[PDB]
Amino acid sequence: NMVETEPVQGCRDFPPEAMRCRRHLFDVFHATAKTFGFEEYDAPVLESEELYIRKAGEEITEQMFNFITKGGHRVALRPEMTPSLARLLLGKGRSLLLPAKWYSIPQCWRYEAITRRREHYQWNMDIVGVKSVSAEVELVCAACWAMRSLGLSSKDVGIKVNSRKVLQTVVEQAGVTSDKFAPVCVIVDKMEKIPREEVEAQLAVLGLEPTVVDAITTTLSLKSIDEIAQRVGEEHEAVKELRQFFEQVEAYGYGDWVLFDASVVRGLAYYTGIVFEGFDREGKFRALCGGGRYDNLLTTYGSPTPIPCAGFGFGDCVIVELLQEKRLLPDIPHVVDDVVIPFDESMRPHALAVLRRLRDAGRSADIILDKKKVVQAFNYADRVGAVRAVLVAPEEWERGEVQVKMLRRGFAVPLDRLV
């Protein structure tokens, strides 16, 4: 009998070759988070289904990987991290010191009728307790920093930015009760990649008249902040905020990375203010990352006081395709410093003591574990990219030495000199 060697439908294996690629990326996510002063957290991949019941026609909750425990409890593999984060924050209450800057790199999950990936890793960064656009500034700079760290430039990618408050106004001024607003953002998010007829249809389903639909479409196609200003005023808070945002990003030195786009809304119900989305400037890939401000979610979860929040998620799949296309993911193979080679099996104990010493000195080192010829041991050393082979032979050992060969003739060296 033969076991199924392929992973479960829509899930990825990470043998060493693929793991090095993932590690290269996560190392940047971690390093960027540390540079920016964010704290790591984590929570269970398994959460209560109840945590995601938002009733706004979101794709994320529609495609929920859910099931029922033997105990009858309705659960899901998390489709996103933000609800888990909020649960932790709400759990802490007044004991949480603010501001708080928390990051994680959870695997998140989806399930579709179409048998597409069902899992991905998503770097999450969130700032909690900060009212002003400085939070969004910092988050957008963090995302650019990560991409620049990966070797991309502002010629390769950007982050396009908007605020939902502009549309909020239009919807409210058009006589539509604010309860329809989140559903509208969800529908209008689809504007980009499906027919306008199909989107207009969906909005009409919500009970909004053609004239109201009109204003929405128009405001999505406005190309500048000044044209927004003409539409809603120069001190509509949206304008002041976006200007402050762009000014602050410019002062940090990432002005070439960011721009305004009135069509950016995102697909999540809970964004209340600034929203943003990373993209490739060749128009070839899906969104690289996405985020925004969500000031009401915690109130929504039963927080007795409103807690301002903003953040983003940054997936592991699209960024990697982009990097591959741009030839910014060279395979650096697995490597070690030293390979210790017993001359024969009688030298194994001596070679072990040498191994101990090298590792004690902070070196990465292998020892040849099987019985083999010296030449094969050198073949192995080359396979693992050793800087150095350390041959432990009877002759040198009697002199208190080993034979060392730099791989990146051969020379006898006292034990103490090795390290």
Ligand X SMILES: Nc1ccc2cccc(O)c2n1
Ligand Y SMILES: N[C@@H](Cc1c[nH]c[nH+]1)C(=O)O
Binding-site residue positions: 80-82, 110, 122, 126, 266, 270-271
Q: How far apart are CA 52 and CA 101, in angstroms?
A: 23
- For residue 377 the two structure tokens come to 């041991």
Q: Give, as ranges, the residues between 124 and 183 that touch ligand Y (CB under 6 A).
A: 124, 126
Nearer to ligand Y, 89 or 170 (CB): 89
Q: What angle do CA 96, 121, 252 make, to 5 degrees?
A: 65
Q: How many CB atoms lie within 10 A of CB 65?
A: 18
Q: How far apart are CA 271 and CA 277, in angstroms?
A: 13
1 binds a second copy (CB under 8 A): yes
Give first-to-last CA distance, the chain, whole Å: 50
Q: What minimum distance in Å lies between the beta carbon of 408 and ligand X? A: 6
Q: How far apart are CA 318 and CA 82, in angstroms?
A: 20
Partner from ligand X, ligand Y, a second copy, none binding residue 124, C-beta < 5-8 Å depending on class = ligand Y
Q: Give, as ranges, the residues between 254 and 293 that touch ligand X (CB under 6 A).
A: none
Binding residue (CB under 6 A) for ligand Y from 290, 347, 357, 396: 290
Bridge partners (DSSP) listed for residue 126: 102, 311
* Contact indicator for 256, 148 with CB cutoff of 8 Å: no
Question: Candidates 117-125, 175-183, 229-237, 391-399 — which segment interacts with ligand X by CB under 6 A?
Answer: 117-125
350 binds a second copy (CB under 8 A): yes
335 binds ligand X (CB under 6 A): yes
* Contact indicator for 292, 242 with CB cutoff of 8 Å: no
Q: Give, as ranges, the residues between 362 and 401 that touch ligand X (CB under 6 A).
A: 385, 387
Collapsing DSSP states into helix, strand and coil, what is residue 388? strand
Q: Mask of contacts with a second copy, 111-140, x by CB under 8 A?
A: x---x---x-------x--xxx-xx-xx--
What DSSP designation does 332 have?
A: P
Nearer to a second copy, 132 or 324 (CB): 132
Q: Give, as ranges, the residues between 73 and 102 that touch ligand Y (CB under 6 A).
A: 80, 82
Report DSSP letters for 202-262, one per residue: HHHHTT--HHHHHHHHHHHT--SHHHHHHHH-TTSHHHHHHHHHHHHHHHHT-GGGEEE-T
Q: Give, as ranges, the residues between 207 and 246 that touch ligand X (CB under 6 A).
A: none
Q: How far apart are CA 160 and CA 260, in angstroms?
A: 6
Binding residue (CB under 6 A) for ligand Y from 183, 273, 311, 342: 311
- For residue 408 the two structure tokens come to 């990146």
408 binds ligand X (CB under 6 A): yes
Nearer to ligand Y, 16 or 195 (CB): 16
196 binds ligand X (CB under 6 A): no
Nearer to ligand X, 129 or 385 (CB): 385
Q: How far apart are CA 35 and CA 276, in angstroms?
A: 21
- For residue 168 the two structure tokens come to 């909020």
Q: Mask of contacts with a second copy, 140-169, x by CB under 8 A?
A: -----x------------------------
Q: What is the helix (H) or strand (E) element at residue 394, kind and residue range?
A: helix 394-398
H helix runs in 307-347, sequence order = 318-325
Number of residues that bind ligand X (CB under 6 A): 16
Binding residue (CB under 6 A) for ligand Y from 65, 102, 103, 312: 312
Q: What minimum distance in Å lies between the beta carbon of 412 and ligand Y? A: 39
Q: What minimum distance in Å lies between the beta carbon of 268 and ligand Y? A: 6
Which of 260, 263, 259, 292 is CA-nearest to residue 192?
Answer: 263
Sort residue 69 into left (φ over 0), alpha (ψ -120 to 50) or beta: beta
Q: What minimum distance in Å lies between the beta carbon of 169 and ligand Y? A: 23
Question: Candidates 180-188, 193-201, 207-215, 244-252 — which segment interacts with a second copy by CB under 8 A?
Answer: 244-252
Question: Candidates 33-41, 111-119, 233-241, 257-265 — which segment interacts with ligand X by CB under 6 A?
Answer: 111-119
- In terms of residues, how long is the chain? 419
Which residues bind to ligand X, rule: CB under 6 A? 60, 79-80, 108-110, 117-120, 315, 332, 335, 385, 387, 408
